[PDB]
Amino acid sequence: GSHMLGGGLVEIPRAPDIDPLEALMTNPVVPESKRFCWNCGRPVGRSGASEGWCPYCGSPYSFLPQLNPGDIVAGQYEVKGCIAHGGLGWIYLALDRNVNGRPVVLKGLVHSGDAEAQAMAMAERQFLAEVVHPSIVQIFNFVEHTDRHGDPVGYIVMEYVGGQSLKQKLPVAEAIAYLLEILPALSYLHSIGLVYNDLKPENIMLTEEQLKLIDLGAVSRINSFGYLYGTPGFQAPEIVRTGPTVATDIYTVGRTLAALTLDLPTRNGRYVDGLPEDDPVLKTYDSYGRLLRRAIDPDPRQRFTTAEEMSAQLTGVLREVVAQDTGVPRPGLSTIFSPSRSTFGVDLLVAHTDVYLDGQVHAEKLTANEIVTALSVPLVDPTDVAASVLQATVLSQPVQTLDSLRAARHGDFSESVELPLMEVRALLDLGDVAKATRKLDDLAERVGWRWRLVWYRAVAELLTGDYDSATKHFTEVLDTFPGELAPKLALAATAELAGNTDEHKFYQTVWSTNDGVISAAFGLARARSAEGDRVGAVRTLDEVPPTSRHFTTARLTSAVTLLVTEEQIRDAARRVEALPPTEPRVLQIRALVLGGALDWLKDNKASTNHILGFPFTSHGLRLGVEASLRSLARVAPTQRHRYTLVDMANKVRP
Ligand SMILES: NC(=O)c1c(NC(=O)C2CC2)sc2c1CCCC2
Ligand SMILES: [Cl-]
C-alpha cells in the first residue's frame, strides 16, 4: 500500500524497512570531506586527524566509533556495529539480552564530560522514558560504559527504526505532508511542557508504517535553563534570551520546511538565516512562502501560537499547493473564517446586455457593498463572554442583530470583544461605515488592533474607497493565516475595485483550490478577458458546477465574453442553445449571438449550416436577429423601448 499523507492529498509508496543486519556499516568511517566541528560547524581534522580538538573553538571531536563490534555495554547490550553518524557521533546497533536479543540503538549523551557531567546528563534525561507517542522513538534505558581511558561514558538506548531519514530537494506537497504528520507529536510534547528543540530533516524518518521523530536527545522543559540544544541554521535566534518555548519549536518547523524544499545558501555547513530573496519555489507557491516567513519570524510573538494552529494553516497551504499542481480543487472548511456568505460580481458582465430588454443604461460596476455582504467573516472565539448570545443571533439580519445585541448589552458583557465586533460586522453590512469605525477605534483603544479588528478595518476601508489601506490590512491578515482563502478573495476584490492588475493572482488561487467559490470564477474570468485571453475566461467559466444556480449565468457570460473565429461563434451559440426561453437573459443573449454571427458574415464564410436554429446565411441570421428583436419587443417593459426594438427589427429584416 501507499502512505496516505496530508489527509490523502499526498500518496507516498511504502518501502519495507531496513533490517538490522543490512543497516550495519562494514567500514564506518567519516571521510575527510565530511569532517566538521559539531559545535562551530567549521572544517576540522583536515590534511589530517580523526580525533583532536577544534583549533577554532576548542571543542573535542572524534570521528572514531567508541563502541566496537563484539563489545557488551552494561552487561546487557551486545554491540554489532554502526548504522549511522551525526553530531554526537556514531549510532550503534546492539542486541538486547534482557528482551530476547531485540535490536536496540545506542547513542552518546554528551560530547565530553567528567564522570559527574556524564551521570548528570543521564539523571536529567531519565524523564524521557515516560515520553510516549506513536510518532516518537521509544527510549528503553540509560546506560554507563567505562571506556579505554577508564572513564564512564553515558549512552541512551532506543528502539531501532529502520526507516529513511528526510535528509536533493523534495517537492513542496511532499514536504508539507511529512511535517503535517509530526506536528501532532510536537503538540503532544508541548501539552506536557516539553520542547523538541532539534527538529531537522536528519531527525525525521519515514518508516513503512509512519513518520517518526527519532532523536529525543535535545528534548527539554519550556523556559528551562542550562545547556540549550539544537543546531545553528535551524534553531531560533532568541533561544538564549527566552529559553526553549513553543515559539522556538515553531521556528524549527519553518526552517525544516525551507531546508527540505529550497536552495538555501550555506556559510560553514550552516544554512543562513531568512529565505533566499527571489526563490522560484516561493514564486510558484505564494501562500507557502508566507507560511514559512511567519513560522521563522525573528520575533517569537509573530509566529504561529501553537503547533495545532500552524497545522491548520499548513493544511490549507497544502490544499493550495496540490490543487495548483494537479489541476483538481481541494476544498476544505476553514477553522478561522466562515464560508462565503454570498457571491459578488456574478452578473456584472451579462447585466450590461439587459439594455436589449429595457433600454436602460446598464453600466454595472463591481461595488464594495456587494463584496462586503458576501465576504467570509471571522469565527467567534467560543471563550468570549458573549459567545452564547452571538450563536443565538446567527440567523438574524443586520438590524435585528444590532437590536438584540444592544438590548442584551443594556441588561455582564462589559469585557466582551466579540459582541462589539459583531456590531461592527452588522453596521458594515448596512453601510454605516462611520458608526462602524468609531466602534472599532474605541474597541482598539481597549484591546489593541487584534487581527479581527484589522479584518473589519480593511472591510471598512473598502466601503470608504481607501483601497491602499484595505490591501495593507487584508494582507496583514493573510500573512497571519496564509492557508486561508477568505483573505485572498478579499484582496482579489480590492485589486479590482482599485483598478489594479493582481500580480498575486488571488482569484486564480482561490478558484483553483475551491470550485465552490463562484465569485472567484467570475473574478478570474474578468481578469483573463481584460488581457485578451477570452479563451481562458471561458475555460474558467466552464468549471462552474452545474449544481449552482449561477451555472446558467456563467454559460451566458461565456457567450458574452466570446464576442474572432467561426468556431468561437459556434462556442458562443452552443452555450446559449441548451437554455430554454424560460430562463432570464436567454432571449437577449440569443439576439446578441445571432447579431455577432451576422456581423461576422460580412467578412467571412460559414462551413456550418446553422446558428441557434437559423440558417447560417445572411438571410437566416437577419431572420434570426429580427425574430429575436420582435420577441424582445413583446416583453419590453416600456412602449418607448417597444418602438426601439420594432424599428431595429424592421431594419435588420431580410
Ligand atoms: N533509532 C534509530 O534507529 C536511529 C537510526 N536508524 C537508522 O539509521 C536506520 C538504519 C537506517 S539513525 C538515528 C537513530 C536514533 C538517533 C538519531 C540517529
Ligand atoms: Cl559497561
Side-chain angles (χ1 to χ4, degrees):
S2 293
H3 291 97
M4 291 287 283
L5 306 167
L9 297 156
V10 182
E11 282 201 48
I12 299 301
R14 288 180 203 272
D17 271 10
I18 305 162
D19 189 70
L21 186 284
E22 269 73 49
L24 285 177
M25 294 169 80
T26 304
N27 190 18
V29 81
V30 181
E32 272 204 18
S33 337
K34 308 268 210 209
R35 301 184 163 178
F36 295 96
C37 177
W38 57 267
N39 190 38
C40 83
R42 292 171 81 84
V44 93
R46 318 288 263 248
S47 64
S50 308
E51 298 197 313
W53 280 266
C54 178
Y56 195 83
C57 66
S59 288
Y61 72 89
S62 189
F63 293 120
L64 303 184
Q66 292 303 292
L67 301 170
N68 303 116
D71 281 348
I72 299 163
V73 182
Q76 173 177 8
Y77 301 106
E78 319 182 300
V79 178
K80 306 293 172 181
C82 301
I83 64 184
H85 185 269
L88 264 151
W90 288 99
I91 313 299
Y92 312 98
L93 187 74
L95 262 32
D96 192 347
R97 276 150 97 105
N98 290 5
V99 188
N100 311 302
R102 62 154 172 214
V104 307
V105 162
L106 278 77
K107 176 189 171 147
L109 292 168
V110 297
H111 280 100
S112 63
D114 51 296
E116 204 172 286
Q118 216 71 218
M120 181 78 83
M122 268 169 54
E124 270 170 17
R125 260 170 265 248
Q126 214 83 224
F127 78 87
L128 275 167
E130 260 120 285
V131 163
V132 56
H133 190 273
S135 290
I136 283 161
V137 63
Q138 283 165 61
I139 305 308
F140 295 144
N141 211 354
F142 293 89
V143 129
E144 196 163 284
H145 183 60
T146 298
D147 72 6
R148 293 264 155 74
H149 305 278
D151 289 313
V153 177
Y155 290 95
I156 186 172
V157 184
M158 281 165 262
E159 168 189 9
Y160 174 80
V161 189
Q164 171 80 63
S165 101
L166 300 189
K167 207 142 84 188
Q168 71 148 311
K169 297 278 166 261
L170 288 183
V172 333
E174 273 173 43
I176 290 174
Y178 295 144
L179 273 110
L180 276 184
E181 293 296 324
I182 62 86
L183 278 165
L186 307 177
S187 297
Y188 160 76
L189 289 178
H190 306 158
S191 68
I192 58 174
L194 305 182
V195 201
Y196 187 72
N197 288 327
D198 199 27
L199 189 70
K200 48 172 174 174
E202 184 190 315
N203 284 339
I204 311 157
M205 216 167 54
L206 183 62
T207 77
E208 183 171 41
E209 272 195 31
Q210 272 168 299
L211 274 116
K212 299 248 167 93
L213 261 20
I214 63 176
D215 197 323
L216 298 183
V219 173
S220 79
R221 260 166 263 270
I222 288 167
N223 190 241
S224 64
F225 296 80
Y227 303 106
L228 309 167
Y229 337 93
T231 113
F234 290 99
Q235 68 153 37
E238 82 289 359
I239 196 150
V240 175
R241 172 170 64 90
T242 62
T245 62
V246 169
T248 63
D249 267 355
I250 296 293
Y251 186 88
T252 68
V253 179
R255 298 301 288 166
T256 291
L257 282 176
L260 290 168
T261 50
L262 311 172
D263 278 345
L264 302 183
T266 71
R267 263 280 151 186
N268 275 11
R270 274 88 183 261
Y271 290 123
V272 296
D273 296 344
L275 301 164
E277 209 162 294
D278 281 305
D279 198 290
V281 177
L282 296 197
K283 219 191 97 165
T284 97
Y285 302 115
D286 174 76
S287 72
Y288 176 58
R290 303 179 186 260
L291 174 313
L292 295 186
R293 292 201 289 281
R294 175 113 127 106
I296 72 174
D297 206 283
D299 189 357
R301 304 172 301 172
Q302 293 283 115
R303 300 172 198 151
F304 301 103
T305 300
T306 61
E308 281 192 17
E309 178 185 314
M310 178 174 191
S311 178
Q313 293 314 302
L314 192 56
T315 302
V317 166
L318 182 56
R319 283 159 178 166
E320 283 172 20
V321 163
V322 176
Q324 182 186 307
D325 49 36
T326 63
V328 185
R330 334 303 289 216
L333 178 77
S334 164
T335 56
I336 302 308
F337 286 99
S338 79
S340 303
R341 308 182 283 161
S342 197
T343 50
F344 62 83
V346 169
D347 65 17
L348 287 187
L349 231 157
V350 299
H352 299 158
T353 64
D354 287 344
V355 213
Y356 274 88
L357 225 201
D358 55 42
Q360 295 174 32
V361 171
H362 280 277
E364 284 81 2
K365 260 99 184 196
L366 186 63
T367 62
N369 166 239
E370 193 185 29
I371 301 175
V372 159
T373 51
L375 285 171
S376 303
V377 296
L379 297 180
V380 175
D381 183 335
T383 65
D384 192 281
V385 198
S388 279
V389 299
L390 294 174
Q391 183 48 47
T393 218
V394 91
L395 294 186
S396 293
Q397 314 265 44
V399 175
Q400 180 56 83
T401 300
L402 293 174
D403 283 12
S404 291
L405 291 186
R406 182 180 270 277
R409 209 148 42 78
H410 280 262
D412 187 7
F413 312 102
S414 295
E415 299 313 281
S416 168
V417 183
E418 291 281 356
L419 192 154
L421 278 178
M422 190 65 71
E423 288 169 327
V424 174
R425 177 196 307 173
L427 284 154
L428 289 172
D429 275 7
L430 290 156
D432 302 354
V433 59
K435 280 157 199 158
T437 32
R438 261 192 304 269
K439 212 160 199 97
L440 260 199
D441 286 3
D442 293 337
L443 189 58
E445 206 187 343
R446 184 164 61 86
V447 297
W449 291 100
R450 303 188 186 174
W451 77 263
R452 282 174 182 83
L453 277 77
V454 181
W455 178 265
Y456 288 120
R457 187 184 211 185
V459 171
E461 284 158 351
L462 272 190
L463 297 166
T464 261
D466 182 1
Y467 306 128
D468 293 328
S469 314
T471 293
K472 182 197 182 192
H473 296 129
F474 280 136
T475 301
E476 284 190 37
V477 179
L478 175 55
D479 281 349
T480 301
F481 307 106
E484 300 297 321
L485 295 176
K488 308 196 179 71
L489 189 62
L491 293 159
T494 306
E496 266 210 281
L497 288 181
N500 305 318
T501 306
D502 176 19
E503 25 146 353
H504 294 106
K505 299 159 188 179
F506 284 129
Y507 276 138
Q508 188 184 245
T509 280
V510 173
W511 183 248
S512 283
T513 304
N514 195 330
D515 64 344
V517 186
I518 285 140
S519 294
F522 287 87
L524 174 60
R526 292 187 265 90
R528 290 173 172 195
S529 257
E531 53 142 21
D533 186 13
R534 290 170 295 117
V535 166
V538 169
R539 212 183 59 79
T540 290
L541 287 163
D542 278 335
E543 305 173 334
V544 163
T547 51
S548 173
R549 283 207 169 202
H550 304 300
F551 181 71
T552 295
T553 298
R555 281 283 167 285
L556 292 170
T557 318
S558 280
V560 189
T561 94
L562 278 168
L563 314 160
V564 176
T565 71
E566 186 183 346
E567 186 203 31
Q568 292 179 28
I569 274 108
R570 276 161 34 194
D571 277 339
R574 271 190 280 275
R575 275 146 186 91
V576 191
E577 223 167 36
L579 318 164
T582 282
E583 202 83 299
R585 294 190 168 118
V586 154
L587 176 49
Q588 71 194 46
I589 299 308
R590 273 181 83 72
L592 190 138
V593 159
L594 290 154
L598 179 146
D599 303 321
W600 188 78
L601 273 197
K602 280 156 193 169
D603 287 82
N604 289 287
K605 278 177 184 185
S607 50
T608 271
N609 292 338
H610 85 286
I611 299 298
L612 294 186
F614 292 97
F616 203 159
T617 53
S618 262
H619 185 288
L621 296 168
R622 277 158 78 84
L623 194 86
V625 171
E626 197 204 345
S628 292
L629 294 163
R630 293 191 188 284
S631 160
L632 282 159
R634 256 174 277 112
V635 281
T638 43
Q639 289 169 72
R640 177 193 156 176
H641 200 238
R642 163 135 37 81
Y643 263 104
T644 293
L645 299 157
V646 170
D647 195 32
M648 286 172 166
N650 304 332
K651 251 89 166 193
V652 76
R653 187 209 277 125

Short mmCIF file of all heavy atoms in Angstrom, two decimals, residues 18 23 83-84 91 105 107 137 158-163 203 205 214-215, ligand 1:
data_model
loop_
_atom_site.label_atom_id
_atom_site.label_comp_id
_atom_site.label_asym_id
_atom_site.label_seq_id
_atom_site.Cartn_x
_atom_site.Cartn_y
_atom_site.Cartn_z
N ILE A 18 14.57 -1.26 6.63
CA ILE A 18 15.89 -1.86 6.66
C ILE A 18 16.06 -2.75 7.91
O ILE A 18 15.77 -2.35 9.04
CB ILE A 18 16.98 -0.77 6.51
CG1 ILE A 18 16.72 0.04 5.24
CG2 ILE A 18 18.37 -1.38 6.44
CD1 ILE A 18 17.42 1.38 5.18
N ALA A 23 21.43 -2.77 7.86
CA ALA A 23 21.80 -1.44 8.33
C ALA A 23 23.27 -1.31 8.74
O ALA A 23 23.84 -0.22 8.66
CB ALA A 23 20.88 -0.98 9.47
N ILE A 83 25.32 2.01 12.41
CA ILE A 83 24.28 2.10 11.38
C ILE A 83 24.15 3.53 10.80
O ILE A 83 23.43 3.72 9.81
CB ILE A 83 22.91 1.61 11.95
CG1 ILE A 83 22.44 2.52 13.10
CG2 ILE A 83 23.02 0.16 12.40
CD1 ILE A 83 21.17 2.09 13.81
N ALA A 84 24.86 4.49 11.40
CA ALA A 84 24.76 5.94 11.10
C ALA A 84 25.71 6.80 11.96
O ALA A 84 26.29 6.33 12.94
CB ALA A 84 23.32 6.44 11.30
N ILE A 91 26.14 6.01 15.57
CA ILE A 91 24.95 5.38 16.11
C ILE A 91 25.18 3.88 16.06
O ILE A 91 25.51 3.33 15.02
CB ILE A 91 23.68 5.75 15.31
CG1 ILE A 91 23.60 7.27 15.05
CG2 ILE A 91 22.44 5.25 16.03
CD1 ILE A 91 23.55 8.14 16.28
N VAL A 105 19.22 0.59 19.69
CA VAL A 105 20.19 1.57 19.25
C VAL A 105 20.76 2.35 20.43
O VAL A 105 20.04 2.73 21.35
CB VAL A 105 19.56 2.46 18.15
CG1 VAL A 105 20.34 3.75 17.95
CG2 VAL A 105 19.48 1.67 16.86
N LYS A 107 23.27 5.69 21.49
CA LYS A 107 23.93 6.93 21.07
C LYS A 107 24.46 7.65 22.32
O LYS A 107 23.84 7.58 23.39
CB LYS A 107 22.94 7.79 20.28
CG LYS A 107 23.44 9.15 19.87
CD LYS A 107 22.32 9.99 19.28
CE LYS A 107 22.79 11.43 19.06
NZ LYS A 107 22.16 12.10 17.88
N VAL A 137 10.17 7.85 18.68
CA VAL A 137 11.02 6.71 19.04
C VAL A 137 10.92 6.42 20.54
O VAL A 137 10.83 7.36 21.34
CB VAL A 137 12.51 6.99 18.63
CG1 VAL A 137 13.07 8.18 19.39
CG2 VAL A 137 13.40 5.75 18.80
N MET A 158 17.69 3.12 22.62
CA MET A 158 16.42 3.39 21.93
C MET A 158 15.96 2.21 21.10
O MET A 158 16.73 1.31 20.76
CB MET A 158 16.61 4.49 20.90
CG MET A 158 16.64 5.88 21.38
SD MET A 158 17.30 6.76 19.98
CE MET A 158 19.03 6.89 20.47
N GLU A 159 14.70 2.29 20.69
CA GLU A 159 14.14 1.47 19.64
C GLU A 159 14.93 1.62 18.32
O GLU A 159 15.31 2.73 17.93
CB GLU A 159 12.70 1.92 19.44
CG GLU A 159 11.98 1.41 18.20
CD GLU A 159 10.62 2.08 17.98
OE1 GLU A 159 10.29 3.08 18.67
OE2 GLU A 159 9.87 1.61 17.09
N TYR A 160 15.16 0.50 17.64
CA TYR A 160 15.66 0.53 16.27
C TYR A 160 14.55 0.95 15.29
O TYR A 160 13.47 0.37 15.26
CB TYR A 160 16.25 -0.82 15.87
CG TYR A 160 16.65 -0.88 14.42
CD1 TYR A 160 17.85 -0.33 13.99
CD2 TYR A 160 15.81 -1.48 13.46
CE1 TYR A 160 18.21 -0.36 12.66
CE2 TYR A 160 16.17 -1.51 12.12
CZ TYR A 160 17.38 -0.94 11.73
OH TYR A 160 17.78 -0.96 10.40
N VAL A 161 14.83 1.96 14.49
CA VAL A 161 13.88 2.41 13.50
C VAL A 161 14.60 2.34 12.17
O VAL A 161 15.50 3.13 11.91
CB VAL A 161 13.36 3.85 13.78
CG1 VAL A 161 12.20 4.21 12.86
CG2 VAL A 161 12.91 3.99 15.22
N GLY A 162 14.22 1.38 11.34
CA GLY A 162 14.91 1.10 10.09
C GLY A 162 14.24 1.79 8.93
O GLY A 162 14.00 1.18 7.90
N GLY A 163 13.93 3.07 9.10
CA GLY A 163 13.31 3.86 8.04
C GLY A 163 14.30 4.69 7.24
O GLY A 163 15.53 4.46 7.26
N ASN A 203 16.43 14.18 11.71
CA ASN A 203 15.70 13.63 12.87
C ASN A 203 14.30 13.12 12.57
O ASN A 203 13.59 12.68 13.48
CB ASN A 203 15.64 14.69 14.00
CG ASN A 203 16.96 14.84 14.73
OD1 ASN A 203 17.81 13.95 14.70
ND2 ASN A 203 17.13 15.95 15.41
N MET A 205 12.08 10.48 10.18
CA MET A 205 12.28 9.26 9.41
C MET A 205 10.95 8.71 8.92
O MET A 205 9.98 8.56 9.69
CB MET A 205 13.05 8.23 10.26
CG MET A 205 14.02 7.38 9.45
SD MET A 205 15.25 6.39 10.36
CE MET A 205 14.10 5.54 11.39
N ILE A 214 13.00 10.60 15.57
CA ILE A 214 13.91 9.53 16.04
C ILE A 214 14.96 9.95 17.07
O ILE A 214 15.71 9.11 17.56
CB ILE A 214 14.60 8.75 14.89
CG1 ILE A 214 15.49 9.66 14.03
CG2 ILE A 214 13.57 8.03 14.03
CD1 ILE A 214 16.27 8.89 12.94
N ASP A 215 15.02 11.23 17.41
CA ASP A 215 16.00 11.69 18.39
C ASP A 215 15.40 12.59 19.47
O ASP A 215 14.95 13.69 19.17
CB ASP A 215 17.16 12.42 17.70
CG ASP A 215 18.39 12.55 18.61
OD1 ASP A 215 18.24 12.76 19.83
OD2 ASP A 215 19.52 12.43 18.09
N1 LIG B 1 16.82 4.86 16.43
C1 LIG B 1 17.35 4.64 15.23
O1 LIG B 1 17.18 3.62 14.59
C2 LIG B 1 18.21 5.67 14.60
C3 LIG B 1 18.69 5.48 13.22
N2 LIG B 1 18.41 4.41 12.44
C4 LIG B 1 18.88 4.23 11.20
O2 LIG B 1 19.75 4.93 10.69
C5 LIG B 1 18.27 3.06 10.45
C6 LIG B 1 19.42 2.24 9.86
C7 LIG B 1 18.55 3.11 8.95
S1 LIG B 1 19.67 6.82 12.79
C8 LIG B 1 19.45 7.60 14.32
C9 LIG B 1 18.66 6.87 15.20
C10 LIG B 1 18.36 7.40 16.58
C11 LIG B 1 19.17 8.66 16.88
C12 LIG B 1 19.38 9.60 15.69
C13 LIG B 1 20.13 8.92 14.55
#
